[PDB]
Amino acid sequence: ALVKEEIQAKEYLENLNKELAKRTNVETEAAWAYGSNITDENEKKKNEISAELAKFMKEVASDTTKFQWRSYQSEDLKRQFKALTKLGYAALPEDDYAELLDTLSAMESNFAKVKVCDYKDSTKCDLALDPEIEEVISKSRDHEELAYYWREFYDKAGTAVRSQFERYVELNTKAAKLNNFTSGAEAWLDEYEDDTFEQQLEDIFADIRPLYQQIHGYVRFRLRKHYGDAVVSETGPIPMHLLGNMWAQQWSEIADIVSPFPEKPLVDVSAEMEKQGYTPLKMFQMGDDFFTSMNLTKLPQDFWDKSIIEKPTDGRDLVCHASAWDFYLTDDVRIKQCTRVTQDQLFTVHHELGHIQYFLQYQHQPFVYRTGANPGFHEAVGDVLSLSVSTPKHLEKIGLLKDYVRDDEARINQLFLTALDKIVFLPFAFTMDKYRWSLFRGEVDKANWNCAFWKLRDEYSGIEPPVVRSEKDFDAPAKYHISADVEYLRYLVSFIIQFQFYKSACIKAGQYDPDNVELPLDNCDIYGSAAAGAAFHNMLSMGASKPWPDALEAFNGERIMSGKAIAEYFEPLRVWLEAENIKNNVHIGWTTSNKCVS
Ligand SMILES: *[C@@H]1O[C@H](CO)[C@@H](O[C@@H]2O[C@H](CO)[C@@H](O[C@@H]3O[C@H](CO[C@H]4O[C@H](CO)[C@@H](O)[C@H](O)[C@@H]4O)[C@@H](O)[C@H](O[C@H]4O[C@H](CO[C@@H]5O[C@H](CO)[C@@H](O)[C@H](O)[C@@H]5O)[C@@H](O)[C@H](O)[C@@H]4O)[C@@H]3O)[C@H](O)[C@H]2NC(C)=O)[C@H](O)[C@H]1NC(C)=O
């Protein structure tokens, strides 16, 4: 009888979910120990426990065939069983899974251990990406110095790992096919539960792309005035080392030389943070305050007790790329961040605390539901708060921005600053997964892998390497997420939907009205808003219990991912920028790059 079996299945699921949570706790603890302290011993422990959990997952997936779950009445029960059938990498044979884990840790440890020699001191060779190299890329305006650090880092973080990356692609593909996906692309895309998801993103990207072109053109124009035409051409792709970021993913670090109105205020509170004696602890406490002010959950004692919020001062190797950790018990949540006292880092703190909040909000759910509605939702939470933190309105409240006059010109400066982070990022994010998808799908021959990467960066972002690269180089793994096997489409989704969340939260807070000149979207602060917090609670507490459109509906009554909100935010910038580019006869678009030899 199916009626009797469905009752037994419910009891089966409740026990199994609790078992999976407990087993994942053990794996997570070992993964935490390795990421905070990279050693051969900790790698071995992390990978051996993962192999053990994978073995158990195999048994679980096999056990689901004993239940007629597709025949059940409960949509909830069917959804849980469906989740249990999806093995991911755990579908691989024992030896293949062990090899993949060895390959993944080899790539992540390589990235984390990268050290370069000082440009001015060839005997000082202990400069790591975080913070040494990133500080130079963000602050130096010496184009040759920038080019040196670009080359040194990409050679060490990218090229050195080509063979491991090749084996990773092979095993990722094998795993996907064992789960009956065509490739790792489809495996990743399955997390969005929508068979038109790629086309939806193409459509949204196409709408925002013209604005990006205008920003690109104007920045290129302004860079030519700074560096001269020998360094930056009018018609070519922008040399990427000049954009204030190792991967040219976000350009806010060069705002001081590309700002629309240089005589008017440009928000950079890093100096005031230092002057007021800000610490990493204070920054996290302020983040905690923001969430609690919205009637959301305070950080538990375990967070403060166990988190790493500063780069360790011993000689040890660790992964410094910030991360949040759910240990699948009650209130055992942690962040690992190599925190610095800067404005950008203040946003990063809020980003990571967004993940933590999500963990706390759904910790009551069955294990399989203890994750985001889709990967983009998880990335978006903290960024919604960061948008309000970034406003002159909020920064004045916390005394970090002083003597600020919010006229038309200062507003354009602030909108442009935000766009250098939010619009510029969109083509970058798309290319990270367009690249990996093409490799996963077997669409690029191995002899063309490196120039396939730079071709996409050219086509979509209009940027290029500072020096000529070839198929002797392999540059993709120089980006953390590529070395660390972290899906990137989540960020494209996040940057779109975070404006849907922000707009709705702002309206709920009484902080945005499109017909009121005193309440513009770009100066909305949701701090202290219980109404905005209620929307977050309603959505986040769901976890992955329902398909993501239901989670969006719980927030604001909408069911569709839309670029309307992000375009609405930047509309006043679009009007000004289009006119400014025409006024200055600014060239738009770029010729095909010559910087990757086939
Ligand atoms: C990815 O896709 C794969 C297919 O491309 C898929 O692999 C298939 O999984 C099937 C299991 O669902 C499996 O089907 C079984 O086949 C057995 C014989 O297969 C042999 O010969 C094949 C060549 O003809 C070889 O290719 C194989 O290697 C094998 O050597 C059958 O003996 C078996 O049967 C039994 O089970 C059925 C199922 O019963 C179902 O459930 C209830 C049970 O209570 C039934 O009431 C209900 O009616 C329903 O049918 C019984 O009906 C039957 O009485 C037997 O007990 C079964 O059909 C198949 O072999 C396998 N490979 C191929 C090539 O087809 C993967 O599983 C997919 N992977 C994932 C992760 O989804």
Ligand SMILES: [Zn+2]
């Ligand atoms: Zn994140």
